[PDB]
Amino acid sequence: GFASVPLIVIVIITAIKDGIEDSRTKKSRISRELNFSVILNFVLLFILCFTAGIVNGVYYKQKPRSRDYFEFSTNGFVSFWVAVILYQSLVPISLYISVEIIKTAQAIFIYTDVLLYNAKLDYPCTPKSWNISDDLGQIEYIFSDKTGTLTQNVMEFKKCTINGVSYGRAYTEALAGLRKRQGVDVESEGRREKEEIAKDRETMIDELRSMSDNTQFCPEDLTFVSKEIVEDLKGSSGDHQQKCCEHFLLALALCHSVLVEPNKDDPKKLDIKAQSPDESALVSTARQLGYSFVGSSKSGLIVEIQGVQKEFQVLNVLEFNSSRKRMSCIIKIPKGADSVIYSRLDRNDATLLEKTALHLEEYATEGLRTLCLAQREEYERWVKTYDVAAASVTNREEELDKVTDVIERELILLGGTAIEDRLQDGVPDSIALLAEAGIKLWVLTGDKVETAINIGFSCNVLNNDMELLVVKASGEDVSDPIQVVNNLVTKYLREKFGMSGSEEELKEAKREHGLPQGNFAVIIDGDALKVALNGEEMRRKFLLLCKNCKAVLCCRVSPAQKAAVVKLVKKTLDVMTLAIGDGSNDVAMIQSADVGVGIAGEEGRQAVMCSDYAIGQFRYVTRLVLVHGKWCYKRLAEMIPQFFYKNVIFTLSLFWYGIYNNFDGSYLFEYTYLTFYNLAFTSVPVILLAVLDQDVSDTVSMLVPQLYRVGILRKEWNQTKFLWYMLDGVYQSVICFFFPYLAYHKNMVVTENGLGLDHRYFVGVFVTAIAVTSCNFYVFMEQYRWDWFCGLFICLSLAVFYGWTGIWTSSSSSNEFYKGAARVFAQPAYWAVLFVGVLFCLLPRFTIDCIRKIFYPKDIEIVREMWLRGDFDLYPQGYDPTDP
Amino acid sequence: RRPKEDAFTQQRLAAINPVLTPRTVLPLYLLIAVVFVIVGGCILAQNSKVDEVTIYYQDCMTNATSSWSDIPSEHWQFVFHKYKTYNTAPQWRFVDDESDDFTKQRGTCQIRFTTPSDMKNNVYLNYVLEKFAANHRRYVLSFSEDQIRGEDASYETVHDATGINCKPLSKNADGKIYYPCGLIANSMFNDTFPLQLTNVGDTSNNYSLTNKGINWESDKKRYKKTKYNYTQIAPPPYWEKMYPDGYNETNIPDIQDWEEFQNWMRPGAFDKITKLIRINKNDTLPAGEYQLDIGLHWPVLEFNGKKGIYLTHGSHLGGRNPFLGIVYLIGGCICAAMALILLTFWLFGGRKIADASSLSWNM
Ligand SMILES: *[C@@H]1O[C@H](CO)[C@@H](O[C@@H]2O[C@H](CO)[C@@H](O[C@H]3O[C@H](CO)[C@@H](O)[C@H](O)[C@@H]3O)[C@H](O)[C@H]2NC(C)=O)[C@H](O)[C@H]1NC(C)=O
Ligand SMILES: *[C@@H]1O[C@H](CO)[C@@H](O[C@@]2(O)O[C@H](CO)[C@@H](O)[C@H](O)[C@H]2NC(C)=O)[C@H](O)[C@H]1NC(C)=O
Ligand SMILES: *[C@@H]1O[C@H](CO)[C@@H](O[C@@H]2O[C@H](CO)[C@@H](O)[C@H](O)[C@H]2NC(C)=O)[C@H](O)[C@H]1NC(C)=O
Ligand SMILES: *[C@@H]1O[C@H](CO)[C@@H](O[C@@H]2O[C@H](CO)[C@@H](O)[C@H](O)[C@H]2NC(C)=O)[C@H](O)[C@H]1NC(C)=O
Ligand SMILES: CC(C)CCC[C@@H](C)[C@H]1CC[C@H]2[C@@H]3CC=C4C[C@@H](O)CC[C@]4(C)[C@H]3CC[C@]12C
Ligand SMILES: CC(C)CCC[C@@H](C)[C@H]1CC[C@H]2[C@@H]3CC=C4C[C@@H](O)CC[C@]4(C)[C@H]3CC[C@]12C
Ligand SMILES: CC(C)CCC[C@@H](C)[C@H]1CC[C@H]2[C@@H]3CC=C4C[C@@H](O)CC[C@]4(C)[C@H]3CC[C@]12C
Ligand SMILES: CC(C)CCC[C@@H](C)[C@H]1CC[C@H]2[C@@H]3CC=C4C[C@@H](O)CC[C@]4(C)[C@H]3CC[C@]12C
Ligand SMILES: CC(C)CCC[C@@H](C)[C@H]1CC[C@H]2[C@@H]3CC=C4C[C@@H](O)CC[C@]4(C)[C@H]3CC[C@]12C
Ligand SMILES: CC(C)CCC[C@@H](C)[C@H]1CC[C@H]2[C@@H]3CC=C4C[C@@H](O)CC[C@]4(C)[C@H]3CC[C@]12C
Ligand SMILES: CC(C)CCC[C@@H](C)[C@H]1CC[C@H]2[C@@H]3CC=C4C[C@@H](O)CC[C@]4(C)[C@H]3CC[C@]12C
Ligand SMILES: [Mg+2]
């Protein structure tokens, strides 16, 4: 059996290729436009077959031709049907299987990339869906996430508040954000900063080497740089500051909920496990401060330090609850924001504590993870009330509120933390590249919005010349939120843009394809956003406001909130949206986007499985979008018109033989050329183009990211290009048929010995040679780079045409040639026709390309001229600006 | 774990980026133009020196006389490169045949033409047909590849075969299987051509034309001698004048050594059929007057079709067709003209090649 075998085996090899590169439902836009182009090809086929049937009927209703002498309106219908059988390769199933092969190969090329593989956790770019790769080349919006995608989610303890005094020394990213927003020379003080931190850490490590044996691990994980605390705890205030810092260290080393179990496999390394990273950061900075935790135990925390023994059994553990964020626990002797512990004061005492409150404002300057720790320091009554309150009734809440209101009022502060979450390696460069490419990236941040905008200015999503249209509309102070948000959005839209209108502008922007001009910035919070995406008019108003160039931040967002934002930008104002993220909320953010990238971050891999791609760090998305995205987009945008053109060049050529023969239904080509043309003669060059064609090198596509703007504007693939390729195919089919015919038309003896060609199969060999050569040379002409593999396979496809004509004809099973190769390929008339036919097929297209690369050259032509001149020659093979 | 390397898993193959700079386009549009004009003149000069004699004799039965008379200028076409103005109207003479009862086409047309030059050692006399439709769907599939291959295929194998079977002419009214079956073999050109060009002036040396070798030798590996028994086969409905007594032990045609049949079983792709019927590969055809005696059997005036003889030495690119040379010259001239236009655009108003200030974002 050799009838329709190649389809099933290729389906199996595609399935096994998907199942091989995966262990270690979403259709692209190009596919829908492909369906429309297939409909148009079928319309062309119907026009062809209708004209064929009409002319055949007219011929049968004509003068007594030679039919009724030597051959002996349902005739129109049977003619139409045999024409449909003739002209049916206009659009076969070969297109929808070749596109799947192309997408699978592009996905396994994204997977097998070495510059997308993160060697830290051994996780390359694993495409969870092998059908959207051209979708990356037209990504217009990127909805990132500040949780663990931009920032590496590695909490670091930087500052603290002991005895109402700030202690610590660390240069955070928010400070650089302030320096860049105020207009200070950033990226320059880093040199002297590194040179001074060098000696700071040098004296630090000398002090550690001279203090103790350093029973901790290697100094790589020694994140202790702030010596000031160790300088002041010794003899600044005498024993007072020592007493305060020791009390702070004990309160942080005994009051915690981290599950310590150092194992797997040696008990030397610590295995502090906690659902929250803040407690882990606190215990780690308490260990590295000098109060390490040697050994382990099951019941209690037995800690020995140079002689002192500490085991303070609390007898009860109050886990962290996400609804109230409060627990009343005082440690015997032998936790959130100010909305839970503060704001309850005597409506003249505790002034210094009030001063400590001002430190929160200083913490608002750098935006760290901070909290307040207030414990109230006669002994029998304490344990008595403790044991009688430990066994209260009704979930232990009423008596707890009673005591917290009668005795837990006007506390005294004795602790305070400050933790920072820095960006990943190469996030600012990645954002700068994605902004140069014209991708309007949105940042759906989390806890705090001031730190969010400061960090956005730290990375390259915010920069100068922008207008920070702050829409943190919660009230008049800095009544109902709906009307004030509406007025503020309207005021911004009126005074910052000329947008007098509500509905017309939505349709105007939908027909604009997006062009970010006039760098602006918008910032929304939770309540102002949850009131912005509910009203249908408010939705389009907020969308028209948030159509700025780069910076759109959204703080205090819910999973449904960010999902609805991605829906609003995706469904309304139909564009291509990416939703890179990590976590449970980012799962809902991803599942509702055109492309969903998942960062393999925290222990929860939910955003990696329920996504489309899965990269290690955030920076890789640049190479996933700027290099591979644009590549696959232009690959498909060239392949699809190439495919339709190579089908037209053959079907229309088989149709032109219908002018003669009066559309009776005889095939100009052999029964086996009609199959092998789309199967073997011209199928591999276009696939190898769509799989291996590179716009420019990866270095050039990352050096000039603005090339990506051809995908954002959909300037590569459109119905105009498909129609132009189909018209070129019509013309080239005219040439491919009428050059061999015109060779025959005079005397029909173009055989170099008069023995006799001109079996319609041999004229078909002529025409098929011209058409196959023109198709392959066309694929090569429209290929951006000619490599060792695609050119070899174009030559091999031509050789396959010739060799299989020679194999099939030189065998009695052909039954009508038996010598077609030895009879056609041997006459100089054949080659004389073939060469000039190829010339006349490729000359108008190559000329229009030349007069286009001369008069109106696209940006890629100029960039390629520069890249050949040797501008981008100082960069190595595998270059990417997103690296330390 | 990690992906592979080597410059294939990473798309880093040894490539050549073809930037169409004016220092590479012009060296291409000119290297192509001069080559397509050199071959454009070499072909058109080789094609010019090709002698050709076309003589349409379809109107010989009802427009020629029993005596010699010039052929009307609408039928014949002489093309001799040595003699551009060689009218020399050839004559024809129709001698009727009252014995043959086929009134639509009978007798014999004697055509006397005059060639003022020689034909070097290989003279082909084809017959050209016009308005004969041999490319239609029912026609071109109307034959049996089993009888051609030499098998004694029964009526089922001959008629109930695949798309290639003699559907309308599988079996006669008696019950015999037409040995050459189908509209192709049945409708064979049966005008008998002479085996020698009769020399009018010096009848001592006649230019002999053989009918052997007028088809590809490889065709004799596919058209095999039949294996029938003369009791199951009958002549096709139109071969009944060539075999009035049907078939017997001797008169069964050997389609292997019958090259006119093999030539006709190769249906002409277009409306003009030109099939070789006489060849001379030994002697040069010297100048002079020659007579050709065509026995009119094949009727063409029933469907306004034309039939004629086509005498030529040929060429390397076939016969005389001023297309390959003309189209090569047009391609070369177009290449040169478009190259001159490109040079004008590059001179009379254009950008610098690597003009970084012409990018859409640098505006
Ligand atoms: C040369 O080939 C000719 C190809 O057509 C062939 O013409 C056909 O001749 C047959 C007679 O043999 C004609 O049939 C006539 O006679 C039968 C007798 O019963 C009648 O029933 C028919 O109606 C018809 O009148 C065909 O009509 C005729 N075909 C054409 C197109 O003219 C010659 O007979 C062949 N001659 C030789 C010598 O081989
Ligand atoms: C050359 O062809 C001649 C055709 O006419 C023919 O000679 C004959 O047949 O005819 C001549 C003119 O009608 C006549 O002069 C000869 O005497 C004829 N010959 C015979 C034998 O009867 C011959 O076929 C060829 N002639 C020679 C001499 O070979
Ligand atoms: C087979 O049939 C052919 C023709 O049908 C016979 O050839 C004829 O033979 C007779 C006498 O032998 C001649 O008068 C005719 O002129 C011949 N006709 C042709 C066209 O050549 C042949 O003789 C038959 N053979 C047998 C054995 O009966
Ligand atoms: C050219 O010469 C060849 C032989 O050199 C001729 O072939 C012979 O033709 C006669 C006549 O039909 C046959 O009886 C012989 O059997 C043929 N011999 C071979 C070896 O094929 C050929 O006919 C000549 N051609 C012309 C036009 O005179
Ligand atoms: C003098 C008259 C009878 C000549 C007409 C010949 C007819 C049968 C042939 C010759 C040219 C042919 C046309 C050539 C071009 C095209 C354009 C194509 O997109 C549709 C088919 C169509 C329209 C063909 C239809 C059939 C056609 C018109
Ligand atoms: C826009 C890009 C992508 C594709 C461009 C398609 C162009 C090059 C093709 C498609 C249709 C083709 C034209 C079809 C018809 C003719 C008329 C003929 O007398 C001269 C050639 C000419 C003028 C062709 C020139 C080349 C052509 C215009
Ligand atoms: C000069 C004489 C012999 C020509 C007779 C045949 C003519 C009438 C027919 C046969 C083939 C036909 C052509 C077939 C192909 C094309 C290309 C198409 O895009 C426009 C119509 C056009 C140009 C047709 C015009 C008419 C045409 C040239
Ligand atoms: C018709 C419009 C849209 C495009 C014009 C294209 C014209 C100028 C070109 C394209 C293909 C060319 C045709 C190709 C083949 C033939 C058949 C031949 O027997 C007569 C010349 C003729 C008919 C050519 C005439 C000119 C032609 C029709
Ligand atoms: C020396 C004699 C016996 C050889 C007879 C066969 C000749 C005529 C045939 C067979 C192979 C044919 C060649 C096959 C390949 C090509 C290469 C092409 O670019 C030019 C034509 C050319 C060169 C052909 C010319 C004609 C050719 C040489
Ligand atoms: C663009 C080019 C390659 C077209 C090729 C045309 C070739 C196939 C044709 C055109 C003219 C032909 C040549 C015409 C003259 C001769 C001289 C003879 O003693 C050997 C054959 C030879 C050498 C022919 C070989 C084939 C030939 C060269
Ligand atoms: C660059 C373009 C304009 C070159 C076009 C060349 C044109 C103008 C010339 C070159 C060959 C010429 C053709 C040569 C043969 C024929 C066949 C004849 O029965 C009608 C005239 C016709 C069709 C001529 C028309 C004009 C023609 C096509
Ligand atoms: Mg996250």
Coordinates of N, CA, C and O in Angstrom, one line a residue, chain A residues 414-511:
Chain A
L414 N 10.0 47.1 70.4 CA 11.3 46.6 70.6 C 11.9 45.8 69.5 O 12.9 45.1 69.6
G415 N 11.2 45.8 68.3 CA 11.8 45.2 67.1 C 11.2 45.7 65.9 O 10.1 46.3 65.8
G416 N 11.9 45.5 64.8 CA 11.5 46.0 63.5 C 12.5 45.5 62.4 O 13.7 45.6 62.5
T417 N 11.9 44.9 61.3 CA 12.7 44.4 60.2 C 12.6 45.2 58.9 O 11.9 46.1 58.8
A418 N 13.4 44.8 58.0 CA 13.4 45.4 56.6 C 14.1 44.4 55.7 O 15.2 44.1 55.8
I419 N 13.3 43.9 54.7 CA 13.7 42.9 53.8 C 13.5 43.5 52.3 O 12.5 44.1 52.1
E420 N 14.4 43.2 51.4 CA 14.4 43.6 50.1 C 14.3 42.4 49.1 O 14.8 41.3 49.4
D421 N 13.7 42.7 48.0 CA 13.6 41.7 46.9 C 14.2 42.3 45.6 O 13.5 43.1 45.0
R422 N 15.4 41.9 45.3 CA 16.1 42.5 44.1 C 15.7 41.8 42.8 O 15.2 40.7 42.8
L423 N 15.9 42.6 41.7 CA 15.6 42.1 40.4 C 16.5 40.9 40.0 O 17.6 40.7 40.6
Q424 N 16.1 40.1 39.0 CA 16.9 39.0 38.5 C 18.1 39.6 37.7 O 18.0 40.7 37.2
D425 N 19.1 38.7 37.4 CA 20.2 39.1 36.6 C 19.8 39.4 35.2 O 19.4 38.5 34.5
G426 N 19.9 40.6 34.7 CA 19.6 41.0 33.4 C 18.1 41.4 33.1 O 17.7 41.4 32.0
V427 N 17.4 41.8 34.1 CA 16.0 42.3 34.0 C 16.0 43.7 33.4 O 15.2 43.9 32.5
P428 N 16.8 44.6 33.9 CA 16.8 46.0 33.3 C 17.2 45.9 31.8 O 16.5 46.6 31.0
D429 N 18.2 45.2 31.4 CA 18.6 45.1 30.0 C 17.5 44.4 29.2 O 17.2 44.8 28.1
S430 N 16.8 43.4 29.8 CA 15.7 42.8 29.1 C 14.6 43.7 28.8 O 14.0 43.7 27.7
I431 N 14.2 44.5 29.8 CA 13.1 45.5 29.7 C 13.5 46.6 28.7 O 12.7 47.0 27.9
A432 N 14.8 47.0 28.7 CA 15.2 47.9 27.7 C 15.1 47.4 26.3 O 14.7 48.1 25.3
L433 N 15.5 46.1 26.1 CA 15.4 45.5 24.8 C 13.9 45.4 24.3 O 13.6 45.7 23.2
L434 N 13.1 44.9 25.2 CA 11.6 44.8 24.9 C 11.0 46.1 24.6 O 10.0 46.2 23.9
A435 N 11.5 47.2 25.2 CA 11.0 48.5 24.9 C 11.5 49.1 23.6 O 10.7 49.7 22.9
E436 N 12.8 48.8 23.3 CA 13.3 49.2 22.0 C 12.5 48.5 20.9 O 12.4 49.1 19.8
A437 N 12.1 47.3 21.1 CA 11.3 46.5 20.1 C 9.9 47.1 19.9 O 9.2 46.6 19.0
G438 N 9.5 48.0 20.8 CA 8.1 48.5 20.7 C 7.1 47.8 21.4 O 5.9 48.0 21.2
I439 N 7.5 46.9 22.4 CA 6.5 46.1 23.1 C 6.1 46.9 24.3 O 6.9 47.1 25.2
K440 N 4.8 47.2 24.4 CA 4.2 47.9 25.5 C 4.1 46.9 26.7 O 3.1 46.1 26.6
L441 N 5.0 46.9 27.6 CA 5.0 45.9 28.7 C 4.3 46.5 29.9 O 4.6 47.6 30.4
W442 N 3.4 45.7 30.5 CA 2.7 46.1 31.7 C 3.2 45.3 32.9 O 3.6 44.1 32.7
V443 N 3.2 45.9 34.1 CA 3.8 45.3 35.3 C 2.7 45.2 36.3 O 2.2 46.2 36.8
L444 N 2.2 44.0 36.6 CA 1.1 43.8 37.5 C 1.7 43.4 38.9 O 1.8 42.3 39.3
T445 N 2.2 44.5 39.6 CA 2.9 44.4 40.8 C 2.0 43.9 41.9 O 0.8 43.7 41.8
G446 N 2.6 43.8 43.1 CA 1.9 43.2 44.3 C 1.6 44.1 45.4 O 0.6 44.9 45.4
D447 N 2.4 44.0 46.5 CA 2.1 44.6 47.8 C 2.0 46.1 47.8 O 0.9 46.7 48.0
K448 N 3.1 46.8 47.5 CA 3.2 48.3 47.6 C 3.4 48.9 46.2 O 4.1 48.3 45.4
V449 N 2.8 50.0 46.0 CA 2.8 50.7 44.7 C 3.9 51.7 44.6 O 4.4 51.9 43.5
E450 N 4.2 52.3 45.7 CA 5.3 53.3 45.7 C 6.7 52.6 45.4 O 7.4 53.0 44.5
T451 N 6.9 51.5 46.1 CA 8.1 50.7 45.8 C 8.0 50.1 44.4 O 9.0 50.0 43.7
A452 N 6.7 49.9 43.9 CA 6.5 49.4 42.5 C 7.0 50.4 41.5 O 7.8 50.0 40.6
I453 N 6.6 51.6 41.6 CA 7.0 52.6 40.6 C 8.5 53.0 40.8 O 9.2 53.2 39.8
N454 N 9.0 52.9 42.0 CA 10.5 53.1 42.2 C 11.3 52.0 41.5 O 12.3 52.3 40.9
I455 N 10.8 50.8 41.7 CA 11.5 49.7 41.0 C 11.4 49.8 39.5 O 12.3 49.5 38.7
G456 N 10.2 50.1 39.0 CA 10.0 50.3 37.6 C 10.9 51.4 37.0 O 11.4 51.3 35.9
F457 N 11.2 52.4 37.8 CA 12.2 53.4 37.4 C 13.6 52.8 37.6 O 14.6 53.2 36.9
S458 N 13.8 51.9 38.5 CA 15.1 51.2 38.6 C 15.4 50.4 37.4 O 16.5 50.5 36.8
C459 N 14.5 49.5 36.9 CA 14.6 48.9 35.7 C 14.2 49.8 34.5 O 13.9 51.0 34.8
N460 N 14.3 49.3 33.3 CA 14.1 50.2 32.1 C 12.7 50.2 31.6 O 12.5 50.5 30.4
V461 N 11.7 49.9 32.4 CA 10.3 50.1 32.0 C 9.9 51.6 32.2 O 9.1 52.1 31.4
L462 N 10.5 52.3 33.2 CA 10.3 53.7 33.4 C 11.6 54.4 33.1 O 12.7 53.9 33.3
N463 N 11.5 55.6 32.5 CA 12.7 56.4 32.2 C 12.3 57.9 32.1 O 11.1 58.2 32.4
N464 N 13.2 58.7 31.7 CA 12.9 60.1 31.6 C 12.0 60.4 30.4 O 11.6 59.5 29.7
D465 N 11.6 61.7 30.3 CA 10.7 62.2 29.3 C 9.3 61.6 29.4 O 8.5 61.8 28.5
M466 N 9.0 60.8 30.4 CA 7.7 60.2 30.6 C 6.8 61.1 31.5 O 7.3 61.9 32.2
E467 N 5.5 60.9 31.3 CA 4.5 61.6 32.1 C 3.8 60.6 33.0 O 3.0 59.8 32.5
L468 N 4.1 60.7 34.3 CA 3.5 59.7 35.3 C 2.1 60.2 35.7 O 1.9 60.8 36.7
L469 N 1.2 59.8 34.9 CA -0.2 60.0 35.1 C -0.7 59.1 36.2 O -1.2 58.0 36.0
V470 N -0.6 59.6 37.5 CA -0.9 58.8 38.6 C -2.4 58.7 38.8 O -3.1 59.7 38.9
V471 N -2.9 57.5 38.8 CA -4.4 57.2 38.8 C -4.7 56.5 40.1 O -5.6 55.7 40.1
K472 N -3.9 56.7 41.2 CA -4.2 56.1 42.5 C -5.4 56.9 43.1 O -5.3 57.5 44.2
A473 N -6.5 56.8 42.4 CA -7.7 57.6 42.8 C -8.5 56.7 43.9 O -9.3 55.9 43.5
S474 N -8.3 57.0 45.1 CA -9.0 56.4 46.2 C -9.8 57.5 47.0 O -10.7 57.1 47.8
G475 N -9.6 58.8 46.7 CA -10.3 59.8 47.4 C -9.6 61.1 47.2 O -8.7 61.3 46.4
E476 N -10.2 62.2 47.8 CA -9.6 63.5 47.7 C -8.3 63.6 48.4 O -7.4 64.3 48.0
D477 N -8.1 62.9 49.6 CA -6.8 62.9 50.3 C -5.8 62.1 49.5 O -6.1 61.1 48.9
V478 N -4.5 62.5 49.7 CA -3.4 61.8 49.0 C -2.5 61.2 50.0 O -2.8 61.1 51.2
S479 N -16.7 61.5 46.8 CA -16.3 60.6 47.9 C -16.3 59.2 47.4 O -15.4 58.4 47.7
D480 N -17.3 58.8 46.7 CA -17.4 57.5 46.1 C -16.3 57.3 45.1 O -16.1 58.2 44.3
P481 N -15.7 56.1 45.0 CA -14.5 56.0 44.1 C -14.8 56.0 42.6 O -14.0 56.4 41.8
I482 N -16.0 55.6 42.3 CA -16.4 55.4 40.9 C -16.3 56.8 40.1 O -15.6 56.9 39.1
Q483 N -17.0 57.8 40.7 CA -17.1 59.0 40.0 C -15.7 59.8 40.0 O -15.4 60.4 39.0
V484 N -14.9 59.6 41.0 CA -13.7 60.4 41.1 C -12.7 59.7 40.1 O -11.9 60.4 39.5
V485 N -12.7 58.3 40.1 CA -11.8 57.6 39.1 C -12.2 58.0 37.7 O -11.4 58.3 36.8
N486 N -13.5 58.1 37.4 CA -14.0 58.5 36.1 C -13.5 59.9 35.7 O -13.0 60.2 34.6
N487 N -13.7 60.9 36.7 CA -13.2 62.2 36.4 C -11.7 62.3 36.2 O -11.3 63.0 35.4
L488 N -10.9 61.6 37.0 CA -9.5 61.6 36.9 C -9.0 61.0 35.6 O -8.2 61.6 34.9
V489 N -9.6 59.9 35.1 CA -9.3 59.3 33.9 C -9.7 60.2 32.7 O -8.9 60.4 31.8
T490 N -10.8 60.9 32.8 CA -11.2 61.8 31.7 C -10.3 63.0 31.7 O -9.9 63.5 30.6
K491 N -9.9 63.5 32.9 CA -9.0 64.7 32.9 C -7.7 64.3 32.3 O -7.1 65.1 31.5
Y492 N -7.1 63.1 32.6 CA -5.9 62.7 32.0 C -6.0 62.5 30.5 O -5.2 63.0 29.7
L493 N -7.1 61.9 30.0 CA -7.3 61.7 28.6 C -7.5 63.0 27.9 O -7.2 63.1 26.7
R494 N -8.0 64.0 28.5 CA -8.3 65.3 27.9 C -7.1 66.2 27.9 O -6.8 66.9 26.9
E495 N -6.3 66.3 29.0 CA -5.2 67.2 29.1 C -3.9 66.6 28.7 O -2.9 67.4 28.4
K496 N -3.8 65.3 28.6 CA -2.5 64.7 28.1 C -2.6 64.2 26.7 O -1.6 64.1 26.0
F497 N -3.8 63.9 26.2 CA -4.0 63.6 24.8 C -5.2 64.4 24.2 O -6.0 64.9 25.0
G498 N -5.2 64.5 22.9 CA -6.4 65.0 22.2 C -7.3 63.8 21.9 O -7.2 63.2 20.8
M499 N -8.3 63.6 22.7 CA -9.2 62.4 22.6 C -10.6 62.8 22.9 O -11.3 62.1 23.7
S500 N -11.1 63.8 22.2 CA -12.5 64.2 22.4 C -13.4 63.2 21.7 O -13.6 63.3 20.5
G501 N -13.9 62.2 22.4 CA -14.7 61.1 21.9 C -14.6 59.9 22.8 O -13.6 59.7 23.6
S502 N -15.5 59.0 22.7 CA -15.6 57.8 23.5 C -15.5 56.5 22.7 O -14.7 55.7 22.9
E503 N -16.4 56.4 21.7 CA -16.5 55.1 20.9 C -15.7 55.1 19.7 O -15.1 54.1 19.4
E504 N -15.6 56.2 18.9 CA -14.9 56.3 17.7 C -13.4 56.0 17.9 O -12.8 55.3 17.0
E505 N -12.9 56.4 19.0 CA -11.5 56.2 19.3 C -11.1 54.7 19.5 O -10.0 54.3 19.1
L506 N -12.0 53.9 20.0 CA -11.8 52.5 20.2 C -11.6 51.8 18.8 O -10.6 51.1 18.6
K507 N -12.5 52.1 17.9 CA -12.4 51.5 16.5 C -11.2 52.1 15.8 O -10.6 51.4 15.0
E508 N -10.9 53.4 16.1 CA -9.7 54.0 15.5 C -8.4 53.3 15.9 O -7.5 53.1 15.1
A509 N -8.3 53.0 17.2 CA -7.1 52.3 17.7 C -7.1 50.9 17.3 O -6.0 50.3 17.1
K510 N -8.2 50.2 17.2 CA -8.2 48.8 16.7 C -7.7 48.7 15.3 O -7.1 47.7 14.9
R511 N -8.0 49.7 14.4 CA -7.5 49.8 13.1 C -6.1 50.5 13.0 O -5.7 50.9 11.9

